Amino acid sequence: SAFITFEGPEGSGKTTVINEVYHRLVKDYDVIMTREPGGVPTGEEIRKIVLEGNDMDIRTEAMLFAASRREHLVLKVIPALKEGKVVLCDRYIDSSLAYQGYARGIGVEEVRALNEFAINGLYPDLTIYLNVSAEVGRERIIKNDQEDLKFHEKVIEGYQEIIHNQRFKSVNADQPLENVVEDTYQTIIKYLEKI
Amino acid sequence: SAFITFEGPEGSGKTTVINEVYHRLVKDYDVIMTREPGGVPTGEEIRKIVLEGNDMDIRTEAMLFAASRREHLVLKVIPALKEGKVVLCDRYIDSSLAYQGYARGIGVEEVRALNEFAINGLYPDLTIYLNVSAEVGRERIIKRLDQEDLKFHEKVIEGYQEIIHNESQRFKSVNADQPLENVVEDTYQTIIKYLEKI
Numbered sequence: 001s002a003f004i005t006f007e008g009p010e011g012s013g014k015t016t017v018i019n020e021v022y023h024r025l026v027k028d029y030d031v032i033m034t035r036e037p038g039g040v041p042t043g044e045e046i047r048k049i050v051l052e053g054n055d056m057d058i059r060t061e062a063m064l065f066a067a068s069r070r071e072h073l074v075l076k077v078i079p080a081l082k083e084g085k086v087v088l089c090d091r092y093i094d095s096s097l098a099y100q101g102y103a104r105g106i107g108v109e110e111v112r113a114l115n116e117f118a119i120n121g122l123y124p125d126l127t128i129y130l131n132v133s134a135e136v137g138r139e140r141i142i143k144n145d146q147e148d149l150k151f152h153e154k155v156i157e158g159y160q161e162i163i164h165n166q167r168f169k170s171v172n173a174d175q176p177l178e179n180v181v182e183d184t185y186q187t188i189i190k191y192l193e194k195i
Numbered sequence: 196s197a198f199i200t201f202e203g204p205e206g207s208g209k210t211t212v213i214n215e216v217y218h219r220l221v222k223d224y225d226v227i228m229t230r231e232p233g234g235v236p237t238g239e240e241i242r243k244i245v246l247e248g249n250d251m252d253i254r255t256e257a258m259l260f261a262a263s264r265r266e267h268l269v270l271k272v273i274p275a276l277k278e279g280k281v282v283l284c285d286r287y288i289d290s291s292l293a294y295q296g297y298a299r300g301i302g303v304e305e306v307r308a309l310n311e312f313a314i315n316g317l318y319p320d321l322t323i324y325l326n327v328s329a330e331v332g333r334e335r336i337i338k339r340l341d342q343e344d345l346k347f348h349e350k351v352i353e354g355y356q357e358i359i360h361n362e363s364q365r366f367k368s369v370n371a372d373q374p375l376e377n378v379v380e381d382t383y384q385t386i387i388k389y390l391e392k393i
């Protein structure tokens with residue numbers, strides 16, 4: 001079994017990368033693709049509260065992302081890992097650290113303590129960080145507003161901080177998407193072939 | 196002026212909602228309600244080709260929906276917007292993305308390329324998505340369905356979910372699982388808030 005998370009800002013090619021890597025890994029592994037809340041009923045109800053939120057307090061929002069994360073982990077991820085699956089998970093603890101911790105300004109250490117309560121030591125085996133520059137990410141976002149640009153920059157600064165302070169494998173996401181996919185696939189295969 | 200589209204699967208109460216919201220808005224705004232082809236002659240003739248189709252190729256069907264869309268946009272929508280009107284439109288690009296792109300399986304990116312050729316930058320100012328769960332929607336549709344109809348209905352909803360996830364800024368999702376009086380009220384309030392923001 002392997003619990004592989006994928007992290008990055010928007011415009012990092014993360015959607016293309018996880019989907020193409022899934023289509024390649026499925027030939028050899030029992031693999032699933034998921035994202036929180038991932039169809040888990042309690043998580044889905046929590047997601048409704050977050051998305052129906054009118055100017056929700058940022059700490060309440062962080063605690064709801066954390067509760068959705070625990071439900072998804074306990075009812076979807078852990079059962080799949082027990083079946084020996086390779087779990088490809090789009091966003092996990094590091095998204096809360098970059099978005100709630102850094103970009104929203106709650107503080108990375110405070111959001112870490114919250115998320116460590118939520119995951120109770122179940123950190124990923126491998127975390128792919130799609131390392132995109134703010135400028136390349138901006139162009140992909142436009143294809144797919146000073147405040148929006150500044151928020152995108154802060155998310156990237158937050159990710160740069162989290163990795164500055166073992167499971168992380170940084171992939172150059174400024175390359176064309178074909179190369180980002182190949183490098184991510186090779187990084188995952190190298191890990192899985194080591195058990 | 197404002198160009199407002201309404202989207203949703205069948206069973207979302209979309210017909211009832213737009214007609215009721217339109218009736219209330221008419222008292223206060225220079226507003227019109229339309230849908231494609233909406234009486235535009237070329238659009239009506241294209242509509243006949245689509246509805247008389249005998250197992251029509253899904254790509255041909257998409258191009259005809261896009262051709263009706265442009266004729267309606269050029270002849271009805273754009274002149275009304277130039278006259279300063281609020282235009283309420285029942286189904287637009289996102290219907291093609293969810294139905295032809297996702298549910299019929301041509302591909303959302305391919306159908307978006309087709310429809311961007313048709314609308315030539317005229318995306319809605321606001322799109323109201325009547326967000327119904329597959330289960331409530333099914334129950335409204337019955338107010339049983341075969342396995343092919345349920346699966347198609349579920350794919351349309353999945354498609355809309357994916358389209359709204361990748362382009363949130365334009366969309367305002369209204370909970371359509373609520374009784375229709377509340378869906379009407381939430382939609383009306385969302386629109387008033389937007390129009391007063393102009």
Ligand SMILES: Cc1cn([C@H]2CCCN([C@@H](CC(C)C)c3ccc(C(=O)O)c(Oc4cccc(Cl)c4)c3F)C2)c(=O)[nH]c1=O
Binds near residue numbers: 092096099
């Ligand atoms: C996992 C994680 C993500 N993110 C960000 C990532 C960028 C997208 N962003 C929002 C944007 C919208 C509010 C405009 C966003 C976008 C889409 C959705 C949806 O599922 O449709 C969504 O809902 C969710 C998602 C996950 C859990 C719950 Cl409970 C609700 C959502 F929150 C959430 C954090 O900030 N922290 C985190 O831990």
Ligand SMILES: Cc1cn([C@H]2CCCN([C@@H](CC(C)C)c3ccc(C(=O)O)c(Oc4cccc(Cl)c4)c3F)C2)c(=O)[nH]c1=O
Binds near residue numbers: 242245246286
């Ligand atoms: C705008 C749009 C809608 N839809 C769907 C939505 C659900 C209804 N659905 C059909 C069902 C019938 C075949 C049983 C359906 C139902 C009624 C009619 C009519 O006008 O009476 C109809 O004709 C049209 C409608 C619009 C343009 C043209 Cl050209 C022909 C029609 F197609 C069409 C797409 O799929 N893509 C799109 O872009």
